[PDB]
Amino acid sequence: TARYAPYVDTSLYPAYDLLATADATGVKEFNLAFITSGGSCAPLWGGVTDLANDKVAAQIGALRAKGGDVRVSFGGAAGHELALNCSSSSALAAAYGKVVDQYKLTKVDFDIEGAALPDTAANTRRAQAIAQLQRSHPGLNVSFTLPVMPEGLTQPGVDLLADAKRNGVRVDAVNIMAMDYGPAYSADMGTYAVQAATATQAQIKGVLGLSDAAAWKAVAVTPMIGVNDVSSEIFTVDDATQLVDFAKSKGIGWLSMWSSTRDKQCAAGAVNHADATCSSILQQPLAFTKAFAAYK
């Protein structure tokens, strides 16, 4: 299991060059994002791109030849997670399975947020599907990526995890989205991330029935680099080094970030809002990737 795997939005043009980043930084593990529904119970990249056509997923074989790998992520902030377009857990497991089988995946991620997260009926249907997927694909590593506050997982995240456990899902990591807290949270975003991770560990220790040590290994942290969607909140490179320090002292499962494409300076320099293709702060290219690479 790799300790740092940044998210790569495959919908962005030009297609992110996974191998070029691996050559420049040594980071060769990525969370490819996102598989959603285009209106049917059928997986598509960004809700529109066929599995055989995605130009970032097409790189998986070459990345594996350099010894890297990918975790594919379902859901995300944009678009519609497949549980909302699949009426049964068997159809839903089949949809997820086409992805696992297409790319010979051994790691998957379910990024459940927005309208999907409080849909309790869909969550159970997903948990049933994932338990079935974990039965037909033994060892398939499953992570849930969930919104987080400095005080920990929200109640709908806690409830999603309890539903996953009673439905027989083996949750290998709970990856918190340590970002976008709100206007009442204007303090340092590295300290917030540490605070959120500390609370999350206590919560999943109980919900997932793990030892203290096992619960730390089950924590994963994903900040939004640079200016956040909540524009007043900035996760700086200094914040990344604080998160790396904390991840080392606790043995956190892995770090990630939103996102690899944003890990460069905008053409205008520093800007006061978030952008899908740059960080909105001053930096050298791949600054955050090099910073988080210290956790390997």
The closest alpha carbon to 201, from 189, 190, 192, 214, belongs to 214
Structural tokens at position 65: 């030849």
Domain boundaries, the chain: 7-295
Q: How far is CA 101 from CA 39, 133, 136, 137, 202, in A?
A: 21, 11, 11, 10, 35
The closest alpha carbon to 197, from 216, 172, 173, belongs to 216
Quoted resolution (Å): 1.8
User: Computed from CA positions of residues 30, 155, 208, 125, in that sequence, does the dihedral angle turn out positive or negative?
Assistant: negative
Which H, E and C letters describe the chain, residue by residue? CCCECCEEECCCCCCCCHHHHHHHHCCCEEEEEEEEECCCCCEEECCCECCCCCCCHHHHHHHHHCCCEEEEEEECCCCECHHHCCCCHHHHHHHHHHHHHHHCCCEEEEECCHHHCCCHHHHHHHHHHHHHHHHHCCCCEEEEEEEEECCEECHHHHHHHHHHHHCCCCCCEEEEEECCCCCCCCCCHHHHHHHHHHHHHHHHHHHCCCCHHHHHHCEEEEEECEECCCCCCEECHHHHHHHHHHHHHHCCCEECCECCCCCCCECCECCCCCECCECCCCCCCCHHHHHHHHHC
**Rounded to whole angstroms, how far apart are CA atoms 73 and 172?**
14
What is the CATH architecture assignment of 7-295?
Alpha-Beta Barrel (3.20)
At position 171, the amino acid (one-letter code) is V
Catalytic residues: 113
Contacts of residue 286, Cβ cutoff 8 Å, sequence gap at least 6: 21, 24, 25, 263, 264
Q: How far is CA 74 from CA 38, 185, 202, 204, 238, in A?
A: 13, 28, 26, 21, 30
Structural tokens at position 89: 């857990």
Residues 69, 106: contact at Cβ < 8 Å?
yes
Q: Give 152's strand partners.
A: 149
Residues 103, 63: contact at Cβ < 8 Å?
no
**Rounded to whole angstroms, how far apart are CA atoms 236 and 58?**
32
> Radius of gyration of the chain from Cα atoms?
18
Q: How far is CA 206 from CA 124, 135, 199, 201, 214, in A?
A: 19, 24, 12, 9, 11
**Rounded to whole angstroms, how far apart are CA atoms 188 and 58?**
38
| Structural determination approach | X-ray
